[PDB]
């Protein structure tokens, strides 16, 4: 409907302008401009009245002003000395058909052509690369020197060739050889320096990315680590960082060379023929549209590839971390099958990426060939008409093909850099994520009494906020007295321990240390004054001494030995190969369970904490050590919270608190 109406109205307007209306209009460029304006006004009015301008308006202004404007440009480049132009309506049907085709093709190209996230991520990458500015300055300097030398080499190469082909003068041959070698030597030196600088800049950027991402991850809240997987985080930290800096040495060099050369080449081809120079801009629309489509697809597939790589890395992480459990069920083949399935998904994503890239390269090669054929045909027509000579035509063809190649390379490389930077979106997201934690405190009092107070504390884990765990808990822990928190599994005792250490914030009520919120105390002071021996202690690979003093900047060996003696860990420590310098293994694997618990107790006690939270600290402990570590923990100036599953070796506690289903029960 709308298209037929547009055609009919356009035909009627052109017929009217062909008749007595045209005679009133002037002749020449003003006549064509006025005819186009009248055509546009008539179409706009007759479409606004009929309400068909919703989607056909875009095509109006070009279709009506493509013929006049074109003519103007010609009269501005080839001159107006030629005959006055003919009116659109009076022109034959071929001009109208070509105008329709031009308007439609421009409309389609603009639809394809119409990013901020990529730009902001690239700006962030530039901010991260700022510290490497001197290296980039040196690289740019060497690049400029290399280009300048490579502009001089060809003259002497040609001199050598000419001397060989024609009369051979030994002196000229030697001089040409010497100068060719000299300039090649200088250019090669500069190119090597440039490449080395770019490579080192890339490596520094990669290491900086890794450090910043890891330091940002360390600051996140614990719900972040509950909602994510360690293998996938490691996959990000080891692969997306590589992607973010994987192209500088080559892409930067190519971009900068092309930028240096394009301006001069365009100047030259303007000097030869501005008409053909304007004609040569035919390629840019198609180039940019194709790049946009391909870049969208490429970025999508790159993100999917990184996700799949993370999943496969998690498969490997789980299989290797729990090796003794997979091997005790004869399930290695199952893990290998899972990994092979993940690798198959990754392979299919890789194949999609490569196939699309190959198709894009084929498409742009075809575009290049077609546009070069078109330019050659137009230049041949001009040369036949006598506008330009053979040498001018050849020089312009060389220059215009060179600029076409340079512009295509610029567009492709810029899009490739944007795709590579934007495919690593999770890295930037993690680096810029704000932990769901309260603002850091500043209280570091010299003297701490240790009086803890839970006041109507209600807590629900942020991962599952719909299920409360604590319901109006309220109690007091005094120094010099022992409080035994007892209840069944799932009661919420470890949740109380976590809240008392400020690992999580209560959804209601308050946790007070010395009458002030515990979140208002400094991180280091708080966690050096309030220490816990966890349910299943986690050790880190390294010496026993590091594990005991894990988090202390400077702890003397006498303190470590005293802590070991207090926890009864000195008995089995001296039986090790190197005493306190013996490697414990990953997760303390080369140890018995009771030895791990004793080492954790020694680590907790080395700090002389004001508040000590023993969360099942004597579960994997033999009866003798359980009796030994019964009640000496308190010293009259230390608050102690002994969490026990049952009323086992806790009846010697001053206060008893029974917890069931998150509710405190009075004695």
């Amino acid at each position: 409907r709308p298209w037929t109406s547009l055609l009919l109205v356009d035909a009627a307007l052109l017929w009217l302008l062909q008749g007595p209306l045209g005679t009133l209009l002037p002749q020449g460029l003003p006549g064509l401009w006025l005819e186009g304006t009248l055509r546009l006004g008539g179409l706009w009015g007759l479409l606004k009245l009929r309400g068909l301008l919703g989607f056909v308006g875009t095509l109006l202004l070009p279709l009506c002003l493509a013929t006049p404007l074109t003519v103007s440009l010609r009269a501005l480049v080839a001159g107006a000395s030629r005959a006055p132009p003919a009116r659109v309506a009076s022109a034959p049907w071929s001009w109208l058909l070509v105008g329709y085709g031009a308007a439609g093709l421009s409309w389609s190209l603009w639809a394809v052509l119409s990013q901020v996230n990529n730009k902001v991520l690239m700006w962030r990458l530039l901010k991260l690369s700022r510290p490497d500015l001197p290296l980039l300055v040196a690289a740019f300097f060497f690049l400029v020197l290399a280009v300048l030398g490579e502009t001089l080499i060809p003259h002497y190469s040609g001199r050598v060739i000419d001397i060989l082909g024609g009369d051979f003068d030994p002196h000229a041959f030697a001089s040409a050889i010497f100068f060719m070698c000299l300039f090649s030597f200088g250019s090669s030196l500069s190119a090597g320096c440039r490449g080395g600088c770019f490579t080192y800049t890339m490596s520094r950027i990669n290491l900086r990315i890794r450090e910043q991402l890891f330091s940002s991850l360390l600051r996140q809240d614990l719900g972040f680590f509950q909602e994510t997987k360690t293998g996938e985080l490691n996959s990000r930290l080891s692969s997306d960082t590589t992607l973010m800096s994987n192209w500088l040495p080559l892409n930067a060099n190519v971009l900068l060379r092309s930028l240096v050369k394009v301006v001069g080449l365009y100047g030259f081809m303007l000097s030869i023929s501005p008409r053909l120079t304007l004609l040569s801009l035919l390629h840019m629309p198609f180039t940019i549209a194709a790049e946009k489509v391909y870049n969208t697809r490429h970025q999508e597939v790159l993100r999917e590839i990184q996700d799949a790589v993370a999943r496969a890395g998690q498969v490997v992480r789980e299989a290797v971390g729990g090796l003794q459990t997979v091997r005790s069920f004869g399930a290695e083949e199952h893990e290998v099958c899972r990994y092979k399935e993940a690798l198959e998904q990754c392979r299919q994503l890789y194949w999609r990426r490569d196939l699309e890239r190959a198709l894009y390269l084929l498409v742009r090669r075809v575009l290049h060939l077609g546009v070069q054929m078109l330019m050659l045909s137009c230049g041949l027509q001009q040369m036949q008409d006598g506008e330009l000579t053979q040498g001018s035509l050849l020089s312009f063809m060389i220059y215009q093909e060179s600029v076409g190649s340079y512009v295509q390379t610029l567009v492709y490389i810029y899009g490739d850099m944007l795709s590579n930077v934007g495919a690593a979106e999770k890295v930037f997201s993690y680096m810029d994520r704000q932990p769901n934690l309260p603002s850091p405190g500043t209280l570091a009092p010299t003297t701490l009494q240790g009086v803890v107070k839970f006041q109507d504390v209600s807590f629900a884990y942020p991962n599952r906020p719909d299920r409360p765990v604590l319901k109006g808990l309220t109690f007091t822990l005094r120094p010099g007295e022992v409080t035994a928190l007892v209840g069944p599994n799932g009661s919420g005792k470890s949740t109380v321990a976590a809240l008392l250490q400020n690992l999580y914030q209560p959804t209601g009520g308050q946790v007070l240390l010395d009458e002030k919120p515990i979140s208002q105390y400094e991180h280091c002071y708080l966690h050096s004054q309030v220490v816990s021996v966890g349910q299943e202690p986690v050790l880190f690979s390294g010496s026993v001494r590091n594990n005991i003093a894990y988090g202390l900047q400077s702890c003397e060996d006498d303190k470590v030995m005293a802590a070991a003696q207090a926890a009864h860990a000195d008995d089995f420590i001296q039986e090790m190969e190197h005493g306190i310098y013996t490697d414990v293994g990953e997760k303390g694997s080369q140890l018995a369970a009771g030895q791990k618990q004793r080492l954790a107790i020694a680590r907790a006690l080395v700090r002389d904490p004001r508040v000590l939270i023993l969360d099942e600290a004597t579960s994997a402990l033999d009866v003798q050590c359980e009796q030994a570590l019964q009640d000496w923990n308190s010293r009259g100036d230390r608050t102690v919270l002994v969490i026990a599953h049952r009323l086992q070796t806790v009846q010697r506690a001053h206060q008893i608190l029974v917890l069931q289903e998150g509710k405190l029960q009075k004695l």
């Binding site: 293998g231 890395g313 490997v316 290797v320 971390g321 290695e332 990994y339 092979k340 990953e586």
Partner: protein, 50 residues
């Protein structure tokens, strides 16, 4: 396509070989180390190869 097949096959073979070792091989080689060798060394090798 051929290089993708090569990459996948090599990664699978390396993972299987790692899992075929003995119980103490995983106390000398730590989890992150083995994971980096399996997931990252093979990928770089395959990219360079292609």
């Amino acid at each position: 396509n051929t290089m993708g097949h090569v990459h996948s096959h090599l990664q699978g073979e390396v993972f299987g070989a790692v899992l075929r070792q003995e119980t103490e091989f995983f106390q000398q080689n730590q989890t992150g180390n083995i994971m980096s060798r399996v997931t990252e060394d093979t990928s770089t090798l395959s990219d360079s190869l292609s």
